[PDB]
Each structure stands twice: as C-alpha cells, then as structure tokens.
Ligand SMILES: Nc1nc2c(ncn2[C@@H]2O[C@H](COP(=O)(O)OP(=O)(O)O)[C@@H](O)[C@H]2O)c(=O)[nH]1
C-alpha cells in the first residue's frame with residue numbers, strides 16, 4: 001500500500017473537469033485518504049511544491065498559473081498508487097501524452113495540464129507533508 | 135447567488151459514485167466554495183445535522199449509516215443553488231425519484247440515498263455553520 005499526492009489544478013476548475021479527473025482515479029479503485037480544497041493556494045506553498053524547478057525558466061509563470069484559481073489536494077492510497085496514478089495522468093508534454101490518459105484526452109498545454117501526481121515515494125512523502133502538514 | 139450545503143454520503147464512497155454525483159452538480163455550472171473530506175464524521179455533527187428528525191423512528195439507523203464510511207461536505211455557490219441542487223437530487227423515496235435525477239438514476243433505498251442537500255435558505259445557513267464553523 002502506497003500514498004501519493006494529487007493536485008487538481010486551476011485549469012480543471014476553469015474547464016469544469018474536476019469530477020472527470022477524480023472519476024478516472026476513482027474508477028481505478030484508489031481511495032481518498034485526505035483531501036483539501038483551496039480557493040487559492042498560498043504562493044509559498046506552490047513554491048515549495050515546485051522547489052526542484054526553482055531554476056527553470058518556467059518557474060515563476062507556473063507559480064502564477066497555480067495560484068490563478070482553486071486547487072484540490074488529495075492523498076490517494078492503494079497498491080503501487082504512485083506509479084499507477086502517474087501512468088493514468090499521462091506525460092507532461094502534449095506531443096507525448098497518450099490517448100486514454102488524463103492529459104492525453106483532456107490537456108493541450110505543457111503548463112495547463114490539469115493534474116499533478118507525485119513521481120516517486122520520496123517526493124510523495126515530501127508533497128504530502130507540504131499539503132497536509134498535520 | 136446562494137450557497138447550499140451538500141453531503142456526499144458513505145454509500146457513494148462504497149459504490150464509487152463520488153465523482154459521478156459531483157460531476158452532475160459541476161456540469162450544471164455550480165462552484166465549490168468550501169470542501170472537507172471526513173474519513174468518518176463525528177456522531178455529534180451528524181446528530182446536529184439531522185436534529186429535525188431526532189424523534190423519528192429512523193433517526194438512529196440513519197445516524198449509524200452516516201458514520202459507516204467517509205463523507206464529503208461541500209458548499210456550492212450559484213444563482214438559486216438551493217432549489218436547483220434539490221431538484222437535481224431527487225425525491226428521498228425511491229418510488230418517487232425521477233429518472234434524470236441523482237437519486238432517480240442511482241439510488242435504490244430511502245436511507246442509502248447518496249446525497250444530502252440543504253432544503254431552504256435557513257437550513258443552508260445552519261448546515262454550513264455545522265460543517266464549516268470556519
Ligand atoms: N518543460 C516545461 N515544463 C513546464 C513549462 N511550464 C510549466 N511547466 C510545469 O512544471 C511542472 C512540473 O514539471 P514536471 O515535474 O517535469 O512535470 P509533471 O510531473 O508531469 O507535472 C509541470 O506540471 C509543468 O506544468 C514549460 O514551459 N516547459
């Protein structure tokens with residue numbers, strides 16, 4: 001059993017895709033362990049979440065996008081949940097994300113890509129503690 | 135603009151219909167304003183939520199059901215949200231709920247009926263204050 005951190009991004013809200021995204025994960029039989037709705041996440045939180053990208057040219061624009069609307073943070077639990085949810089999510093790059101994946105079916109941009117999911121056990125622990133410090 | 139309180143009930147988690155239900159409200163263009171996941175709601179909030187029914191024969195069994203699994207409490211905002219979401223919800227009695235409604239399509243029991251929605255302006259204020267004391 002593993003736990004992974006998922007963010008539903010502001011573009012899901014703008015486009016009314018929140019349920020569509022959550023439903024894909026729900027249909028694969030992952031269970032919600034914690035969940036938090038943010039009318040607007042604090043920029044500091046976003047900066048921490050993306051600390052590993054701080055030197056990338058897109059860092060600030062991505063932070064702006066991530067505070068541009070609401071977010072839902074969710075901790076999902078299930079056997080190999082981290083890798084499995086990453087496969088459902090689909091690749092970041094719109095030239096690569098596979099039809100059948102969340103990004104492959106629904107996302108058309110490298111930034112506005114609807115959903116974050118932890119990429120490893122090490123980052124899951126980190127991200128979960130950022131969004132759910134308790 | 136109005137705000138209404140919705141509970142996603144434990145039978146929705148059991149039957150994996152959480153997204154399906156939230157999705158119907160999202161497609162109607164209502165906006166999440168607050169949201170909290172409860173792994174198990176405290177008995178006292180449930181009894182206060184249903185205080186109107188405290189002397190009814192079904193009170194204890196209903197309360198028991200409502201703590202039998204997780205729930206999500208959500209505040210939705212929109213023009214005439216209270217009456218419109220109630221219309222989406224459908225009649226408590228499965229002999230009466232209309233196809234096209236949440237309960238008409240999905241519920242088959244007077245108690246395990248998937249969703250709560252505030253029935254009036256006054257009850258919405260009260261229920262919001264219970265679940266989001268803030
Ligand atoms: N390569 C790239 N990444 C971007 C850009 N703009 C924003 N990002 C964001 O940086 C976030 C974190 O990147 P990464 O860990 O590689 O992607 P993810 O795990 O698939 O979300 C991604 O979700 C992108 O939204 C861009 O212009 N180029």
Ligand SMILES: Nc1nc2c(ncn2[C@@H]2O[C@H](COP(=O)(O)OP(=O)(O)O)[C@@H](O)[C@H]2O)c(=O)[nH]1
Nearest residue numbers: 187192196225226244245246247249250251253
């Ligand atoms: N067994 C039983 N349970 C009931 C009955 N009426 C209401 N309940 C339960 O009490 C909850 C609140 O009832 P009510 O406000 O009338 O219905 P609602 O607004 O449609 O949820 C319902 O969701 C049912 O679980 C009934 O006639 N029999």
Ligand SMILES: [Mg+2]
Nearest residue numbers: 116117118119
């Ligand atoms: Mg990443």
Ligand SMILES: [Mg+2]
Nearest residue numbers: 250251252253
């Ligand atoms: Mg009622």
